[PDB]
Amino acid sequence: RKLCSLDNGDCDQFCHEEQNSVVCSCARGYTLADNGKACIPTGPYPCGKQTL
Amino acid sequence: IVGGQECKDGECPWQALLINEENEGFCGGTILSEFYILTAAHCLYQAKRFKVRVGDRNTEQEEGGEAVHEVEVVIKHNRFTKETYDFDIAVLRLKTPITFRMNVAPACLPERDWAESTLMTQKTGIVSGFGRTHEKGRQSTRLKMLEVPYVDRNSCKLSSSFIITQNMFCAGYDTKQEDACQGDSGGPHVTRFKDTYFVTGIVSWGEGCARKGKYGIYTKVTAFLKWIDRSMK
Numbered sequence: 006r007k008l009c010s011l012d013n014g015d016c017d018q019f020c021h022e023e024q025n026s027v028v029c030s031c032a033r034g035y036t037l038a039d040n041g042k043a044c045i046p047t048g049p050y051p052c053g054k055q056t057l
Numbered sequence: 058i059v060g061g062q063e064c065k066d067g068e069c070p071w072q073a074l075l076i077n078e079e080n081e082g083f084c085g086g087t088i089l090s091e092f093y094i095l096t097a098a099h100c101l102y103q104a105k106r107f108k109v110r111v112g113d114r115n116t117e118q119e120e121g122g123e124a125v126h127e128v129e130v131v132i133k134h135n136r137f138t139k140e141t142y143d144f145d146i147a148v149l150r151l152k153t154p155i156t157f158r159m160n161v162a163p164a165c166l167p168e169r170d171w172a173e174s175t176l177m178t179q180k181t182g183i184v185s186g187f188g189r190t191h192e193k194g195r196q197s198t199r200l201k202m203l204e205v206p207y208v209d210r211n212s213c214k215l216s217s218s219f220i221i222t223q224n225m226f227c228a229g230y231d232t233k234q235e236d237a238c239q240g241d242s243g244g245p246h247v248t249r250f251k252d253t254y255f256v257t258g259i260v261s262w263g264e265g266c267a268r269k270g271k272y273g274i275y276t277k278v279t280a281f282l283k284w285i286d287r288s289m290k
């Protein structure tokens with residue numbers, strides 16, 4: 006297990022392998038955090054979050 | 058839904074219900090965005106005219122969050138055939154945008170490669186709807202959800218009396234009495250990853266409900282991600 010196969014590359018959401026390294030990204034309505042791993046909602050009702 | 062649990066407050070906010078002229082649900086859908094609903098193509102023959110309800114968990118009371126939306130455009134997959142149930146997918150564009158709130162929110166559309174490697178390899182997904190609670194029975198008045206294991210593709214083909222195309226996948230149980238059922242068609246199959254739910258399937262068909270040796274058959278959303286994207290644009 007390497008890169009994206011190793012715990013999803015430490016990405017919150019989408020993990021891609023460009024060159025020989027991890028590149029994380031997010032669904033629409035989220036912005037990639039400064040750490041390039043976490044996905045930050047742009048609004049109060051981001052996709053895929055239960056409204057609890 | 059046979060077995061499973063009630064969707065509690067805010068737990069299934071992407072659920073949509075297709076309602077006929079008589080204001081009765083006959084199929085489910087998944088909220089994709091403020092203007093778009095994902096459903097099954099086969100649901101489009103079950104009502105001449107229909108609208109979409111969101112925010113509903115109990116068809117007997119007014120929870121305050123329900124909203125009815127008229128459909129502006131129906132986009133049915135042109136390759137869908139009643140004979141094989143292949144390409145069982147449609148997208149609905151609403152006349153007015155959905156207002157997100159408690160019990161009303163979109164499910165995320167994943168990327169294909171990642172969804173197939175990471176979501177579809179998870180142990181389970183979640184199916185939901187207002188469908189029958191027993192093979193023989195009436196539609197549920199309450200929204201229900203059920204955790205359904207992903208089923209090995211080989212086992213599913215062996216179990217099926219009909220061809221399981223590459224646009225289909227199986228989920229559920231061999232013998233345990235839990236499955237989707239009549240009226241759940243078109244509804245969401247979502248997969249949770251790090252507390253974010255991604256749409257992975259559309260309730261499509263089954264040889265009865267919760268039968269021994271049979272599984273639930275779902276449209277494989279990952280096979281239609283480009284088609285969905287084009288339909289939304």
Ligand SMILES: O=C1[C@@H](NS(=O)(=O)c2ccc3cc(Cl)ccc3c2)CCN1c1ccc([C@H]2CCCN2)cc1F
Pocket residue numbers: 139140141142192219220236237238239240241242260261262263264265266267272273274275
């Ligand atoms: O979907 C159902 C059943 N109706 S149901 O209302 O009980 C139902 C409806 C949807 C379901 C969805 C799931 Cl995921 C599980 C059970 C379901 C059960 C009865 C038989 N059936 C069915 C429909 C289409 C096909 C086609 C495929 C190739 C050839 N013909 C096969 C079927 F068995």
Ligand SMILES: [Ca+2]
Pocket residue numbers: 113114115116117118119120123
């Ligand atoms: Ca209600």
Ligand SMILES: [Mg+2]
Pocket residue numbers: 229230231232233267268269270271272
């Ligand atoms: Mg079974």
